[PDB]
Scaffold this active site. Structure first.
Site, mmCIF file in Angstrom:
data_model
loop_
_atom_site.group_PDB
_atom_site.id
_atom_site.type_symbol
_atom_site.label_atom_id
_atom_site.label_comp_id
_atom_site.label_asym_id
_atom_site.label_seq_id
_atom_site.Cartn_x
_atom_site.Cartn_y
_atom_site.Cartn_z
ATOM 1 N N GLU A 1 38.621 -41.785 47.394
ATOM 2 C CA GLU A 1 39.062 -40.795 46.428
ATOM 3 C C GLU A 1 40.584 -40.736 46.387
ATOM 4 N N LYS B 1 52.114 -10.753 42.169
ATOM 5 C CA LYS B 1 52.653 -12.077 41.896
ATOM 6 C C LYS B 1 51.696 -13.189 42.287
ATOM 7 N N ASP B 2 50.888 -12.985 43.327
ATOM 8 C CA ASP B 2 49.814 -13.914 43.636
ATOM 9 C C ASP B 2 48.720 -13.892 42.584
ATOM 10 N N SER C 1 57.523 -15.807 57.228
ATOM 11 C CA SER C 1 57.761 -16.911 56.315
ATOM 12 C C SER C 1 59.246 -17.246 56.252
ATOM 13 N N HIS D 1 52.653 -14.980 61.952
ATOM 14 C CA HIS D 1 52.991 -13.566 62.003
ATOM 15 C C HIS D 1 54.047 -13.253 63.053
HETATM 16 C C1 HEM Z 1 43.157 -23.775 54.226
HETATM 17 C C2 HEM Z 1 44.323 -24.235 54.666
HETATM 18 C C3 HEM Z 1 45.558 -23.429 54.792
HETATM 19 C C4 HEM Z 1 45.804 -22.120 54.507
HETATM 20 C C5 HEM Z 1 44.837 -21.105 53.958
HETATM 21 C C6 HEM Z 1 47.164 -21.877 54.834
HETATM 22 C C7 HEM Z 1 47.744 -20.625 54.638
HETATM 23 C C8 HEM Z 1 49.074 -20.396 54.860
HETATM 24 C C9 HEM Z 1 49.738 -19.219 54.504
HETATM 25 C C10 HEM Z 1 49.133 -18.001 53.860
HETATM 26 C C11 HEM Z 1 51.031 -19.381 54.842
HETATM 27 C C12 HEM Z 1 52.079 -18.338 54.630
HETATM 28 C C13 HEM Z 1 52.484 -18.318 53.153
HETATM 29 C C14 HEM Z 1 53.285 -19.532 52.731
HETATM 30 O O1 HEM Z 1 54.122 -20.044 53.490
HETATM 31 O O2 HEM Z 1 53.152 -20.009 51.597
HETATM 32 C C15 HEM Z 1 51.182 -20.650 55.407
HETATM 33 C C16 HEM Z 1 52.363 -21.159 55.862
HETATM 34 C C17 HEM Z 1 52.475 -22.461 56.300
HETATM 35 N N1 HEM Z 1 51.537 -23.402 56.394
HETATM 36 FE FE1 HEM Z 1 49.755 -23.174 55.905
HETATM 37 N N2 HEM Z 1 47.748 -22.987 55.290
HETATM 38 C C18 HEM Z 1 46.840 -23.964 55.296
HETATM 39 C C19 HEM Z 1 46.974 -25.282 55.699
HETATM 40 C C20 HEM Z 1 48.158 -25.831 56.164
HETATM 41 C C21 HEM Z 1 48.373 -27.190 56.401
HETATM 42 C C22 HEM Z 1 47.309 -28.245 56.216
HETATM 43 C C23 HEM Z 1 49.695 -27.329 56.817
HETATM 44 C C24 HEM Z 1 50.464 -28.538 57.206
HETATM 45 C C25 HEM Z 1 49.967 -29.769 57.203
HETATM 46 C C26 HEM Z 1 50.257 -26.022 56.822
HETATM 47 C C27 HEM Z 1 51.559 -25.745 57.131
HETATM 48 C C28 HEM Z 1 52.124 -24.505 56.878
HETATM 49 C C29 HEM Z 1 53.550 -24.245 57.106
HETATM 50 C C30 HEM Z 1 54.602 -25.174 57.638
HETATM 51 C C31 HEM Z 1 53.758 -22.977 56.752
HETATM 52 C C32 HEM Z 1 55.049 -22.217 56.815
HETATM 53 C C33 HEM Z 1 55.711 -22.240 55.448
HETATM 54 C C34 HEM Z 1 56.903 -21.321 55.426
HETATM 55 O O3 HEM Z 1 56.955 -20.312 56.150
HETATM 56 O O4 HEM Z 1 57.860 -21.568 54.672
HETATM 57 N N3 HEM Z 1 49.308 -25.139 56.404
HETATM 58 N N4 HEM Z 1 49.972 -21.269 55.405
HETATM 59 C C1 LIG Z 2 51.984 -14.720 54.970
HETATM 60 O O1 LIG Z 2 51.593 -14.105 53.748
HETATM 61 C C2 LIG Z 2 50.235 -14.063 53.517
HETATM 62 C C3 LIG Z 2 49.309 -13.614 54.460
HETATM 63 O O2 LIG Z 2 49.700 -13.186 55.705
HETATM 64 C C4 LIG Z 2 47.952 -13.580 54.161
HETATM 65 C C5 LIG Z 2 46.967 -13.096 55.190
HETATM 66 C C6 LIG Z 2 47.509 -14.013 52.903
HETATM 67 C C7 LIG Z 2 46.038 -13.987 52.536
HETATM 68 C C8 LIG Z 2 45.267 -15.219 52.920
HETATM 69 C C9 LIG Z 2 44.197 -15.261 53.699
HETATM 70 C C10 LIG Z 2 43.901 -14.194 54.709
HETATM 71 C C11 LIG Z 2 43.172 -16.361 53.610
HETATM 72 C C12 LIG Z 2 42.024 -16.147 54.583
HETATM 73 C C13 LIG Z 2 40.883 -17.112 54.470
HETATM 74 C C14 LIG Z 2 39.775 -17.149 55.206
HETATM 75 C C15 LIG Z 2 39.673 -16.565 56.583
HETATM 76 C C16 LIG Z 2 38.509 -17.774 54.690
HETATM 77 C C17 LIG Z 2 37.383 -16.767 54.579
HETATM 78 C C18 LIG Z 2 36.070 -17.238 55.127
HETATM 79 C C19 LIG Z 2 34.921 -16.568 55.179
HETATM 80 C C20 LIG Z 2 34.653 -15.326 54.389
HETATM 81 C C21 LIG Z 2 33.798 -17.017 56.071
HETATM 82 C C22 LIG Z 2 32.500 -17.338 55.355
HETATM 83 C C23 LIG Z 2 31.593 -16.162 55.145
HETATM 84 C C24 LIG Z 2 31.111 -15.690 53.998
HETATM 85 C C25 LIG Z 2 31.928 -15.549 52.751
HETATM 86 C C26 LIG Z 2 29.673 -15.267 53.872
HETATM 87 C C27 LIG Z 2 29.277 -14.825 52.474
HETATM 88 C C28 LIG Z 2 27.827 -14.462 52.357
HETATM 89 C C29 LIG Z 2 26.899 -15.025 51.588
HETATM 90 C C30 LIG Z 2 27.196 -16.093 50.581
HETATM 91 C C31 LIG Z 2 25.455 -14.621 51.684
HETATM 92 C C32 LIG Z 2 24.827 -14.191 50.370
HETATM 93 C C33 LIG Z 2 23.343 -14.000 50.467
HETATM 94 C C34 LIG Z 2 22.624 -12.935 50.147
HETATM 95 C C35 LIG Z 2 21.372 -12.555 50.876
HETATM 96 C C36 LIG Z 2 22.998 -12.011 49.029
HETATM 97 C C37 LIG Z 2 48.437 -14.452 51.962
HETATM 98 O O3 LIG Z 2 47.973 -14.861 50.741
HETATM 99 C C38 LIG Z 2 49.798 -14.477 52.260
HETATM 100 O O4 LIG Z 2 50.745 -14.917 51.364
HETATM 101 C C39 LIG Z 2 50.783 -14.203 50.133
HETATM 102 C C1 LIG Z 3 42.024 -14.848 49.524
HETATM 103 C C2 LIG Z 3 41.754 -14.849 48.039
HETATM 104 C C3 LIG Z 3 42.774 -14.090 47.227
HETATM 105 C C4 LIG Z 3 44.207 -14.309 47.648
HETATM 106 C C5 LIG Z 3 45.082 -13.081 47.552
HETATM 107 C C6 LIG Z 3 45.711 -12.872 46.195
HETATM 108 C C7 LIG Z 3 45.843 -11.429 45.788
HETATM 109 C C8 LIG Z 3 45.025 -11.055 44.579
HETATM 110 C C9 LIG Z 3 44.029 -9.954 44.829
HETATM 111 C C10 LIG Z 3 43.773 -9.066 43.642
HETATM 112 C C11 LIG Z 3 44.018 -7.601 43.888
HETATM 113 C C12 LIG Z 3 45.004 -6.978 42.936
HETATM 114 C C13 LIG Z 3 44.737 -5.517 42.626
HETATM 115 C C14 LIG Z 3 45.334 -4.602 43.638
HETATM 116 C C15 LIG Z 3 44.840 -3.193 43.521
HETATM 117 O O1 LIG Z 3 43.795 -2.798 43.961
HETATM 118 O O2 LIG Z 3 45.701 -2.409 42.857
HETATM 119 C C16 LIG Z 3 45.445 -0.979 42.810
HETATM 120 C C17 LIG Z 3 45.131 -0.559 41.394
HETATM 121 O O3 LIG Z 3 45.654 -1.555 40.495
HETATM 122 C C18 LIG Z 3 44.904 -1.835 39.437
HETATM 123 O O4 LIG Z 3 44.998 -1.246 38.403
HETATM 124 C C19 LIG Z 3 43.954 -2.965 39.701
HETATM 125 C C20 LIG Z 3 44.006 -4.034 38.658
HETATM 126 C C21 LIG Z 3 42.756 -4.891 38.635
HETATM 127 C C22 LIG Z 3 42.998 -6.356 38.888
HETATM 128 C C23 LIG Z 3 42.114 -6.951 39.954
HETATM 129 C C24 LIG Z 3 41.515 -8.283 39.592
HETATM 130 C C25 LIG Z 3 41.093 -9.113 40.777
HETATM 131 C C26 LIG Z 3 41.058 -10.595 40.514
HETATM 132 C C27 LIG Z 3 40.408 -11.400 41.607
HETATM 133 C C28 LIG Z 3 41.338 -11.791 42.722
HETATM 134 C C29 LIG Z 3 40.645 -12.262 43.972
HETATM 135 C C30 LIG Z 3 39.493 -13.190 43.691
HETATM 136 C C31 LIG Z 3 46.645 -0.266 43.384
HETATM 137 O O5 LIG Z 3 47.611 -0.048 42.325
HETATM 138 P P1 LIG Z 3 49.082 0.465 42.718
HETATM 139 O O6 LIG Z 3 50.032 -0.615 42.270
HETATM 140 O O7 LIG Z 3 49.272 1.767 41.976
HETATM 141 O O8 LIG Z 3 49.078 0.645 44.208
#
Ligand code: HEM
Ligand SMILES: COc1c(O)c(C)c(C/C=C(\C)CC/C=C(\C)CC/C=C(\C)CC/C=C(\C)CC/C=C(\C)CCC=C(C)C)c(O)c1OC
Ligand SMILES: CCCCCCCCCCCCCCC(=O)O[C@H](COC(=O)CCCCCCCCCCCC)COP(=O)(O)O
Ligand SMILES: CCCCCCCCCCCCCCCCCC(=O)OC[C@H](COP(=O)([O-])OCC(O)COP(=O)([O-])OC[C@@H](COC(=O)CCCCCCCCCCCCCCCCC)OC(=O)CCCCCCCCCCCCCCCCC)OC(=O)CCCCCCCCCCCCCCCCC
Ligand SMILES: CCCCCCCCCCCCCCCCCC(=O)OC[C@H](COP(=O)([O-])OCC(O)COP(=O)([O-])OC[C@@H](COC(=O)CCCCCCCCCCCCCCCCC)OC(=O)CCCCCCCCCCCCCCCCC)OC(=O)CCCCCCCCCCCCCCCCC
Ligand SMILES: CCCCCCCCCCCCCCCC(=O)OC[C@H](COP(=O)(O)OCCN)OC(=O)CCCCCCCCCCCCCCC
Ligand SMILES: CCCCCCCCCCCCCCCCCC(=O)OC[C@H](COP(=O)(O)OCCN)OC(=O)CCCCCCCCCCCCC
Ligand code: HEC
Ligand code: HEM
Ligand SMILES: COc1c(O)c(C)c(C/C=C(\C)CC/C=C(\C)CC/C=C(/C)CC/C=C(\C)CC/C=C(\C)CCC=C(C)C)c(O)c1OC
Ligand SMILES: CCCCCCCCCCCCCCCCCC(=O)O[C@H](COC(=O)CCCCCC)COP(=O)(O)OCCN
EC number: 7.1.1.8
Lengths: 45, 92, 383, 245, 125
Positions: C272, C228-229, C206, C202
């Site tokens: 694997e 688009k995602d 990107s 942040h």
């Molecule tokens: C659960 C694992 C990971 C998540 C959720 C994650 C998520 C992200 C996200 C959301 C971005 C910004 C969007 C993008 O560039 O596509 C990003 C950028 C990046 N991540 Fe990760 N990442 C993960 C693991 C890793 C790993 C394992 C590496 C390297 C070994 C890595 C290296 C990078 C790099 C270099 C960028 C910058 C890409 C750019 O700005 O062009 N990330 N990551």
């Molecule tokens: C730079 O551009 C970005 C960007 O900035 C971000 C933020 C995202 C979005 C990505 C993320 C924020 C990923 C974040 C991922 C995590 C932090 C993982 C989430 C982990 C958790 C939620 C922790 C685990 C906890 C739970 C889910 C508990 C759930 C509860 C349960 C199962 C209990 C249920 C039981 C009962 C009693 C009903 C992008 O996709 C992206 O590019 C488009």
């Molecule tokens: C971390 C895990 C997910 C990664 C992020 C990818 C982003 C996708 C999230 C989906 C949200 C899109 C709807 C946005 C919205 O509220 O638009 C609202 C209303 O849009 C709609 O009509 C909603 C369409 C319903 C599709 C939602 C299906 C969800 C599928 C599951 C995805 C996650 C498991 C705002 O619309 P606006 O464009 O007028 O502002």
């Protein structure tokens, strides 16, 4: 009139060397403290 | 709040790029235009363009490691064949 | 101001996924990050609901996974969605780690974002390896013995660490029961490292495929890269649905369905498909201590890559030879994982040495010298 | 020679994305298990109730599980006593402990086939080609150790499992001819059911999920393009400002 | 990371040597159009990364006109790239318009910053 450097000076590396050995000596003393009770390290303890 | 460091991005209003002047933009609402307008002539002519540009960057690098693995696989097949044990004993 | 920007909790959501300014020309290779966030939630959620039916004892570890598959309502959906999502997790991650190396994403000012990725890369290998021994299959017992007995090469200390890690003299009840409790912990550490990973993303944002400044043309994250995602989310959940409902056991190995036996070894101990190539780097060196140093270096060699690249252009897009040798290195890794599938026999050993040499030399000789002439061809070709 | 001969792909009726098991073949395969391979192999992970509504009727399964005996909770003074089986119990194997299995079969340990289909490479093709892949004599050049039979498909060649499949060793309840090829096609079907009793429901829930997701995937492309339509056709012009300022 | 003055002293020597400027320059010119940045309307110096204090200094000394035009070629390339197409053939960069407009500013900024680091480590006799 220019000293070998890489953003770190040669003059400043010789000035820190006596202290670097003292910090190294202080680190070994901290190793024996934290790794006491290890039977393998008790061979020289 | 506490002061922060120096970065290479701002936000809406002070994004941090150069000052621009003399560049104009036009756009039309998507409720007034038809999407999917040119999907054909893009799935045929546009894709062929891009393919013809970047395909010797992937083929020759894949054309070297396919003949290298095959002449080792068909060589390992002779070394462990009934006709190639005599060469096997000199490499074993 | 608006409530989404005034509230303490909603202002963090606003500045990360709603009002975040994105480059207007990033292609589909930048969708890979959100797919890993989707897959991290899948593993955790499908793991908490599946941890309600699993016993970590060496007596009940294997038998309980069958009870999940035969007795739990939709219990087979839980285990195929969790076993196949682990394999899909690595394929998206390699395409995230390869897009970064192609467009020069590791270069400054994003080196910390590059190093945090390598830490995330290791913890996921351990998390997948730890969860692999939880099943206590025949392949998981011997995959545990070989990997854990690897630290017996550190002099004078290895024999105690190995006995400390096993909790005893071999892989027995004390090993599996502590492997599962660790497997539940590490994903919460990865989730915390991803938070630190997005914090370093942040500060600068990107990158874009052109490799130039992106501060001139920005569009908001919402309604453009949220929808688009959604295109790749539905395509990822469709290919995953094909591997879960139509061919669940294609990626795995059939020997994991045998209960682990300490007396009889399998015909071929193979890892694997995602750890397969590094298995060849380990086995190329004809020594025990030197194998560990060589095996782990291949992960750590990525760390010097911001220093070896001597180019004044980010990426491989406008470079003919730097784009040329990249695909050989890509393929050499694809070839590197091919020998590890084959036995240790003539002439796969000779292939195993030259191939791993060209692997390491790309970072240390080719990338620095081709990047050097490329600066000169660029200079006299314009002058 | 030591990898074992590769077995070809046969025409199984349940291959393909929409085919279910032939539940008439599961009913017949269960009959040739009980009388042929019940003596030396186990099925420890199959409860009795799973057979109701798949291969046999409820009164048929409540009688098959009553021919066996299970150990009951102790009586009023702690003495042990036996009880007849019910629908909640599992299929009993032929041997009490692992040592008694190796005694009857010359030291070889016969595996549990509740997971054999997903545990031997070669899937359904390897079990079928195993029991019908026995030559009348070993190939010229090889002298087998005593007590072991030759079979090329087995990796390494030499195996300890004999021939058990002949002609007309079993009579069916629906008049099907009992040939060596016929039964070997049936047990592999019954054993695949044992390893995957969720087979049919998985393939029909998949059709529902693929059709729903494939049209969701297409609908998302239209919505992505509709919302991206204002940026795809956006047009820029450049007119250099005067250098007076 | 290999500086720019370092790779320019390599250049002016090859240019002046008749044997070298006949052997490799006729091979370098095909490397530029094969790279293919000209077709999106990009001058070479717009490709260099600018997230370091050396390039940020030269980008400030750049005149207004060459900074306004530089803003437009980058915007046009960003817009053209997202459409998965190229510019019309009659707007591409020719051979003569691709001039080193960002060269002298990079060079005058490194020699004044080389002097600073060579004066911070003077060992006076
Ligand atoms: C659960 C694992 C990971 C998540 C959720 C994650 C998520 C992200 C996200 C959301 C971005 C910004 C969007 C993008 O560039 O596509 C990003 C950028 C990046 N991540 Fe990760 N990442 C993960 C693991 C890793 C790993 C394992 C590496 C390297 C070994 C890595 C290296 C990078 C790099 C270099 C960028 C910058 C890409 C750019 O700005 O062009 N990330 N990551
Ligand atoms: C730079 O551009 C970005 C960007 O900035 C971000 C933020 C995202 C979005 C990505 C993320 C924020 C990923 C974040 C991922 C995590 C932090 C993982 C989430 C982990 C958790 C939620 C922790 C685990 C906890 C739970 C889910 C508990 C759930 C509860 C349960 C199962 C209990 C249920 C039981 C009962 C009693 C009903 C992008 O996709 C992206 O590019 C488009
Ligand atoms: C971390 C895990 C997910 C990664 C992020 C990818 C982003 C996708 C999230 C989906 C949200 C899109 C709807 C946005 C919205 O509220 O638009 C609202 C209303 O849009 C709609 O009509 C909603 C369409 C319903 C599709 C939602 C299906 C969800 C599928 C599951 C995805 C996650 C498991 C705002 O619309 P606006 O464009 O007028 O502002
Ligand atoms: C494949 C090539 C092809 O056929 O076209 C490529 C072709 C190439 O165009 P381009 O401009 O050169 O490149 C576009 C970019 O690559 C990408 O730009 P984009 O996002 O505008 O394009 C979306 C892209 C999909 O892009 C992705 O999802 C990523 C690519 C993944 C690999 C390809 C898909 C597998 O479209 C496809 O490739 C669809 C393939 C399946 C049909 O683009 C199209 O034809 C797009 C339209 C495809 C059909 C869309 C139909 C939507 C309408 C459905 C209505 C609802 C029906 C159900 C109701 C219930
Ligand atoms: C034969 C290829 C036909 C396509 C074509 O124009 O050939 C040249 C074309 C290269 O065109 P380019 O403009 O020179 O470079 C593409 C850019 O990267 C610009 O990338 P993009 O925006 O075109 O998207 C690249 C890719 C994006 O594809 C992905 O990133 C795959 C997403 C998969 C999501 C689920 C993964 C699940 C785990 C793995 C299974 O999707 C496509 O290629 C759509 C083409 C319609 O070849 C491909 O991109 C083939 C990609 C196949 C996947
Ligand atoms: C440093 C912490 C030492 C803790 C301690 O006290 O380690 C005491 C134990 C010995 O325990 P033991 O003698 O009961 O078993 C001895 C059995 N023959 O060290 C060991 O060799 C085992 C653990 C060593 C440390 C592992 C790595 C830690 C990081
Ligand atoms: C694996 C993906 C690794 C990162 C992407 C990559 O290497 O793509 C390179 C190439 C096309 O990428 P370009 O940046 O050249 O596309 C714009 C051209 N004007 O992509 C290709 O040539 C197709 C690669 C398909 C895999
Ligand atoms: C006469 C006793 C006997 C009968 C009857 C019998 N088997 Fe076996 N089977 C064995 C023995 C003994 C082994 C162990 C041999 C070894 O692995 O070398 C074995 C091994 C196997 C294996 C393991 C092969 C592998 O590659 O490890 C399979 C599968 C198998 N049997 C299937 C069957 C099926 C299917 C049937 C009937 C439907 C059957 N057996 C009937 C004795 C028998
Ligand atoms: C990124 C996170 C995770 C990854 C990559 C992961 C990966 C794996 C893998 C590969 C297996 C073996 C699958 C198989 O072949 O059968 C497994 C098993 C298991 N995991 Fe996870 N896991 C993760 C998170 C979790 C979490 C958070 C939990 C519990 C809260 C969990 C619980 C389990 C259980 C109980 C098993 C054994 C059940 C079984 O597979 O039959 N996992 N995990
Ligand atoms: C497959 O090879 C292995 C491996 O065998 C082990 C044990 C670990 C380490 C795993 C553990 C047993 C737990 C230690 C993990 C942590 C990150 C510590 C976190 C908590 C403190 C690995 O990281 C690893 O990959 C290189
Ligand atoms: C971290 C991300 C969390 C996102 C979800 C929480 C959003 C909460 C928005 C409502 C809110 O802030 O109302 C709060 C009250 O919230 C509570 O009482 C408990 C909230 C617990 C939430 C647990 C998830 C009122 O907010 P307030 O009116 O003070 O506005 C401050 C800025 N004007």
């Amino acid at each position: 009139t220019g000293l070998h450097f890489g953003r770190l000076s040669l003059r400043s590396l010789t000035a820190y060397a006596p202290n670097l050995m003292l910090w190294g000596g202080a680190s070994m003393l901290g190793l024996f403290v934290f790794t006491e009770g290890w039977p393998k390290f008790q061979d020289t303890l | 709040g506490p002061p922060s460091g120096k970065t290479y991005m701002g936000w809406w209003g002070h994004m941090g790029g150069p000052k621009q002047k003399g560049i104009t933009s036009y756009a039309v609402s998507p409720y007034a235009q038809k999407p999917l307008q040119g999907i054909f002539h893009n799935a045929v002519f546009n894709s062929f363009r891009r393919f013809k540009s970047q395909f010797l960057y992937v083929l020759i690098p894949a054309g070297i490691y396919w003949y290298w693995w095959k002449n080792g696989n068909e060589y390992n097949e002779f070394l462990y064949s009934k006709a190639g044990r005599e060469e096997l004993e000199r490499v074993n | 101001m608006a409530f989404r920007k005034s509230n303490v909790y909603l202002s963090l959501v606003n500045s990360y996924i709603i009002d975040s300014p994105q480059p207007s020309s990033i292609n589909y290779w930048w969708n890979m990050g959100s797919l890993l966030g989707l897959c991290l939630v899948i593993q955790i959620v499908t793991g908490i609901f599946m941890a309600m039916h699993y016993s970590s004892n060496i007596e009940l570890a294997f038998s309980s996974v069958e009870h999940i598959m035969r007795d739990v309502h939709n219990g087979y959906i839980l285990r195929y969605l969790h076993a196949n999502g682990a394999s899909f997790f690595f394929m998206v991650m390699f395409m995230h780690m390869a897009k970064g190396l192609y467009y020069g994403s590791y270069r400054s000012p994003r080196v910390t974002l590059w190093n945090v990725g390598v830490i995330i890369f290791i913890l996921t290998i351990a998390t997948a390896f730890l969860g692999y021994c939880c099943v206590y299959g025949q392949m998981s017992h011997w995959g545990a013995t070989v990997i854990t007995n690897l630290f017996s090469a550190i002099p004078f200390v290895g024999n105690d660490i190995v006995s400390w890690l096993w909790g005893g003299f071999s892989v027995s009840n004390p090993t599996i029961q502590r492997f599962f409790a660790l497997h539940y912990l590490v994903p919460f550490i990865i989730a915390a490292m991803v938070i630190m990973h997005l914090m370093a993303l942040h500060i600068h944002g990107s990158s874009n495929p052109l490799g130039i400044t992106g501060n001139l043309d920005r569009i908001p994250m919402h309604s453009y890269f949220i929808f688009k995602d959604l295109v790749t989310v539905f395509l990822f959940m469709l290919i995953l649905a094909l591997f879960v409902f139509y061919s669940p056991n294609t990626l795995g190995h059939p020997d994991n369905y045998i209960p682990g036996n300490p007396l009889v070894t399998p015909a071929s101990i193979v890892p694997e498909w995602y750890l397969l190539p590094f298995y060849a780097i380990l086995r190329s060196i004809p020594d025990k201590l030197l194998g560990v140093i060589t095996m782990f270096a291949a992960i750590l060699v990525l760390l010097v890559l911001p220093f070896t690249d001597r180019s004044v252009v980010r990426g491989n897009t406008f470079k003919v030879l730097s784009k040329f040798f990249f695909f050989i290195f890509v393929f050499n890794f694809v070839l590197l994982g091919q020998i590890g599938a084959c036995h240790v026999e003539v002439p796969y050993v000779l292939m195993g040495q030259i191939a791993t040499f060209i692997y390491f030399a790309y970072f240390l000789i080719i990338v620095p010298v081709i990047s050097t002439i490329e600066n000169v061809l660029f200079y006299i070709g314009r002058v | 020679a030591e990898h074992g001969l590769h077995a070809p792909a046969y025409a199984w009726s349940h291959n393909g994305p929409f085919e279910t098991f032939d539940h008439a073949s599961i009913r017949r395969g269960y009959q040739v298990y009980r009388e042929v391979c019940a003596a030396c192999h186990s099925l420890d992970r199959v409860a009795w109730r799973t057979l109701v509504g798949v291969s046999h009727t409820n009164e048929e399964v409540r009688n098959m599980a009553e021919e066996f005996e299970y150990d009951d909770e102790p009586d009023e003074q702690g003495n042990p006593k036996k009880r007849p089986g019910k629908l909640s119990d599992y299929i009993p194997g032929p041997y009490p402990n692992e040592q008694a299995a190796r005694a009857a079969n010359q030291g070889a340990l016969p595996p549990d086939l509740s997971l054999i289909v997903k545990a031997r490479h070669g899937g359904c093709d390897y079990i079928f080609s195993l029991l019908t892949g026995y030559p009348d004599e070993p190939p010229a050049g090889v002298a087998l150790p005593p007590g072991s039979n030759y079979n090329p498909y087995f990796p390494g060649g030499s195996i300890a499992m004999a021939r058990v499949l002949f002609d007309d060793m079993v009579e069916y309840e629906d008049g099907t001819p009992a040939t060596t090829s016929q039964m070997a096609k049936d047990v592999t079907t019954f054993l695949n059911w044992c390893a995957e009793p969720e087979h049919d429901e998985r393939k029909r829930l998949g059709l529902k999920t693929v059709i729903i997701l494939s049209s969701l995937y297409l609908l998302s492309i239209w919505v992505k393009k509709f919302k991206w339509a204002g940026i795809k056709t956006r047009k820029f012009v450049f007119n250099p400002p005067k250098p007076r300022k | 990371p290999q500086s720019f003055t370092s790779i320019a002293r390599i250049g002016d020597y090859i240019l002046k040597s008749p044997v070298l400027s006949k052997l490799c320059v006729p091979v370098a010119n095909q490397f530029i159009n094969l790279a293919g940045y000209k077709k999106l309307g990009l001058k070479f110096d717009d490709l260099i990364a600018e997230e370091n204090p050396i390039m940020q200094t030269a980008l400030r000394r750049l005149p207004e006109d060459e900074s306004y035009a530089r803003a437009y070629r980058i915007i046009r390339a960003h817009q053209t790239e997202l459409t998965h197409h190229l510019l019309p053939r009659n707007e591409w960069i020719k051979a003569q318009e691709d001039v080193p407009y960002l060269l002298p500013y990079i060079l005058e900024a490194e020699a004044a910053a080389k002097e600073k680091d060579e004066l911070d480590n003077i060992e006076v006799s």
